[PDB]
Design a protein around this nucleic acid. Structure first.
Lengths: 120, 137, 228, 150, 102, 51
RNA sequence: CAGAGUGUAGCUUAACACAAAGCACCCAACUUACACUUAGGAGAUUUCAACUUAACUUGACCGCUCUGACCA
């Protein structure tokens, strides 16, 4: 029943959500964030973290993206958040690493569609 | 009637005499990154975060926690770099990485995180849930 | 005018006429590229002819066969003789003849007697008013003894400099020291005569340039001389 | 708003653009590469383009011209008739650059001639008298030119 | 357009693919090193020419100006690629002629 | 470095197989090219007009 | 050879620690080519010690730039 920040139809991305998943793919590292719409960040999963560096061969490949997705899905399941949104550009959506991240989230149980607001 | 701006113009620093010499964005991702970095900066005009973003007291958030432990960054980095050196030397790990079929131990990574980066993530999550606001005032 | 004397020098350069020997890893590169070409290409007319001949012979009028043509072409190849990359100048380390080190670039050096001691330096010429440094370089090319050369000149700005001072012998108020400016050129064709070979000039590469050059002069020259 | 101090914050076309040869730099230059191996010719052309991008020199455009097919004819053994032997194709790749310093022109020429592969011929010259500039104008550019004219 | 000129596709073995991957990943480093060498050598040549030009400007403004002035002799230039073997000074090929087909 | 881009491949979707062959110029110099036929050694003739 | 100055792979007033970060840069894929995009790679705290986190404060050592010395 919480009101979503509707609008922003002329700009990208839309802000009509409660939780947003953001992926930052840098030259050396890959980060994933789950954050609220008001600005606060809920959970993080970054390749700079040692507990995954010690088992990750390379932080800038499909394996790294898959590991980040699985770890973030587990962290979100433990934190209690289940539903989010994903707003990628078409090219990064077609990118193979991101679709494997989506598969990792789905197998971990995170749903990337939020329930519609109950107005009445 | 014109009134001088109260602050620097957003594009005042960029020269325009040699705009053809200036390198362009040439891509949407670079423009998006620069745009979000700029939006994350304070401004002297009215902005969305002024009306909708939460306001925090200027005083620093007071800490009551246990004092941070000390650790030898040089030794830690040396051990980590030799560990990743042997990990990359392992050909089977490299072959799994190139075939995109390698898997990581979730229990091991979580157990190591609980000792390395667990406290800060838990503090951030509690702050997001607002416990530090309701209790402790 | 000024106590520093002005000399314009020329660095005569001949590029390799043949490509450098291929590194084994680059040979592997070529092998893989050709393998990909074979795997991804369509059948050529020669291979189509060979396949048709093989099928017709298996089932059973072409006098000449594809393999026969290949063998004849191989015989023509073994009959023909190619250019010898290794020459008598290479065998003798003839640092004066042009037919040494066809794989790598060569630089000219000349001998001058300064301070009762022969010094290996580039050809130089004093600068005169009303004449460009490239004009002085052309005059130095003419001053070179019994040489018939044609050199390609690129640009007008200097390619480097070397400054020296007199060793307290000729150091005067009017003549304190000197500076020389270097200009690069490309040799199309030409040669020196046979009258003076050992005592006049030598042609050497960047690696052994330091054997003849002073450390300071070499440090200045290596900034613009390359080994590509 | 115009009266408010934030006037003009929304302007964006002043950041967007609306040849004469100097006495120190060359206006327009053309590098033409001739080769009987089209793959090598285009590879060296793209290498030159990448080097130009690295050296931050403007490239007007890179294109190619139609291939000229020159057949090789040989004289037969013990005869006087000319018979076809092989067919050769001459591929030409042209790169048009602008804004090259005279001081840096020698450096660029030296590096390209040192990196020139086997069997490829380079020709770097002006190509300015034949610049008819007869190109098909796009709609927005032609409309802007018409607005300027009227 | 005919499919008779098409060839059967020979399957690649696992060791072959592994060797391909390793050679590619070392080719990347080899070409990076070559590009680094070219970058540093051109930077060194540019710095040397700049220092020579500034020394010339210090020596004499007039010679500096006439050196920085462009040259009209340049840019008819043509260069031909090196050959695999040196040319044969003694060689008389048979007679021939060329034709153009468009 | 002349060998900067001397080792390349054909960037075409449809083409016929080529072979490593040598072209001999007027002065005898040999250059590596690719030809449809397996003629390893080929030499250009001299022209009647250029006499 | 002496007197001053400097120190993170190319750059950075990056580095509170949880961590040596961002960008450019190199290769392959598309493209005549460029560019975008996708998929891959290489990387750095110059070295010793100081009650100790210490690339960060102090020394010695080491490596560079500038000026005097030497100077064809």
């Amino acid at each position: 029943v919480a009101r979503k920040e509707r609008g922003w139809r002329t700009v990208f991305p839309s802000r009509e959500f409660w939780h947003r998943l953001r992926v930052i793919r840098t030259q050396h590292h890959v980060e994933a964030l789950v954050e609220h719409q008001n600005g606060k960040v809920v959970v993080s999963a970054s390749t700079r973290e040692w507990a995954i560096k010690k088992h990750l061969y390379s932080t800038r490949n499909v394996v790294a993206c898959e590991s980040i997705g699985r770890v973030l899905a587990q962290r979100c399941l433990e934190a209690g958040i289940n539903f989010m949104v994903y707003q990628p550009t078409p090219w990064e959506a077609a990118s193979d690493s991101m679709k494997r991240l989506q598969s990792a989230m789905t197998e971990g149980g995170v749903v990337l569609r939020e329930p519609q607001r109950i107005y009445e | 009637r014109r009134t001088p701006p109260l602050g620097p113009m957003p594009n005042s620093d960029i020269d325009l005499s040699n705009l053809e010499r200036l390198e362009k964005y040439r891509s949407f991702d670079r423009y998006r990154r620069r745009a979000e970095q700029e939006a994350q900066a304070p401004h002297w005009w009215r902005t969305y975060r002024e009306y909708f973003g939460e306001k925090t007291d200027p005083k620093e958030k007071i800490d009551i926690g246990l004092p941070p432990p000390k650790v030898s960054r040089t030794q830690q980095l040396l051990e980590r770099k030799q560990a990743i050196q042997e990990l990359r030397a392992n050909v089977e790990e490299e072959r799994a990485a190139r075939l995109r079929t390698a898997s990581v131990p979730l229990d091991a990574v979580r157990a190591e995180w609980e000792r390395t980066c667990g406290p800060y993530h838990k503090q951030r999550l509690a702050e997001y849930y607002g416990l530090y606001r309701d209790l402790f005032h | 005018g000024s106590p520093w004397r002005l000399l314009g020098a020329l660095c005569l350069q001949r590029p390799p006429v043949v490509s450098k020997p291929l590194t084994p890893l680059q040979e592997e590169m070529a092998s893989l590229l050709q393998q990909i070409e074979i795997e991804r290409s369509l059948y050529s007319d020669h291979e189509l002819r060979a396949l048709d001949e093989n099928q017709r012979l298996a089932k059973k009028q072409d006098i000449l066969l594809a393999q026969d043509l290949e063998d004849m072409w191989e015989q023509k190849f073994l009959q023909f003789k190619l250019g010898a990359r290794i020459t008598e100048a290479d065998e003798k380390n003839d640092r004066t003849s042009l037919n040494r080190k066809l794989d790598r670039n060569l630089v000219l050096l000349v001998r001058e007697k300064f301070g009762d001691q022969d010094v290996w330096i580039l050809p130089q010429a004093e600068w005169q008013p009303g004449e460009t440094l490239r004009g002085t370089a052309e005059r130095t090319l003419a001053t070179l003894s019994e040489n018939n050369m044609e050199a390609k000149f690129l640009g007008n700005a200097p390619c480097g400099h070397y400054t020296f001072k007199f060793p307290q012998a000729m150091r005067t108020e009017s003549n304190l020291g000197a500076k020389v400016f270097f200009f690069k050129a490309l040799l199309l064709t030409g040669d020196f005569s046979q009258a003076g070979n050992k005592g006049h000039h030598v042609w050497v590469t960047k690696d052994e340039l330091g054997d003849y050059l002073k450390p300071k002069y070499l440090a200045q020259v290596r900034r613009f001389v390359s080994d590509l | 708003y115009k009266t408010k101090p934030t006037h003009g914050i929304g302007k964006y076309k002043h950041l967007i653009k609306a040849n004469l040869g100097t006495d120190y730099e060359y206006g327009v230059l053309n590098i033409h590469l001739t080769a009987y191996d089209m793959t090598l010719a285009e590879s060296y052309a793209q290498y030159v383009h990448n080097l130009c991008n690295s050296l931050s020199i403007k490239v007007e455009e890179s294109y190619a011209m139609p291939t000229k097919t020159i057949e090789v004819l040989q004289l037969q053994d013990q005869g006087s008739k000319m018979l076809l032997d092989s067919v050769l194709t001459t591929h030409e790749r042209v790169v048009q650059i602008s804004g090259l310093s005279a001081t840096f022109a020698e450096i660029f020429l030296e590096i390209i001639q040192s990196s020139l592969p086997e069997g490829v011929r380079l020709s770097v010259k002006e190509h300015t008298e034949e610049d008819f500039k007869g190109r098909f104008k796009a709609r927005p550019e032609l409309e802007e030119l018409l607005a300027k004219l009227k | 357009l005919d499919k008779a000129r098409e060839r059967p596709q020979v399957e690649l073995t696992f060791e072959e693919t592994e060797r391909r991957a390793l050679l590619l990943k070392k080719w990347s480093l080899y070409k990076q090193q070559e590009r680094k060498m070219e970058r540093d050598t051109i930077r060194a040549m540019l710095e040397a020419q700049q220092e020579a030009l500034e020394e010339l400007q210090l020596e004499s403004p007039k010679l500096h100006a006439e050196a920085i002035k462009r040259d009209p002799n340049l840019f008819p230039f043509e260069k031909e690629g090196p050959h695999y073997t040196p040319p044969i000074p003694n060689y008389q090929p048979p007679e021939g002629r060329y034709n153009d087909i468009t | 470095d002349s060998s900067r881009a001397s080792l390349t491949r054909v960037h075409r979707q449809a083409y016929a197989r080529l072979y490593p062959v040598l072209l001999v110029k007027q002065d005898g110099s040999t250059i590596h090219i690719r030809y449809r036929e397996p003629r390893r050694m080929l030499a250009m003739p001299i022209d009647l007009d250029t006499l």
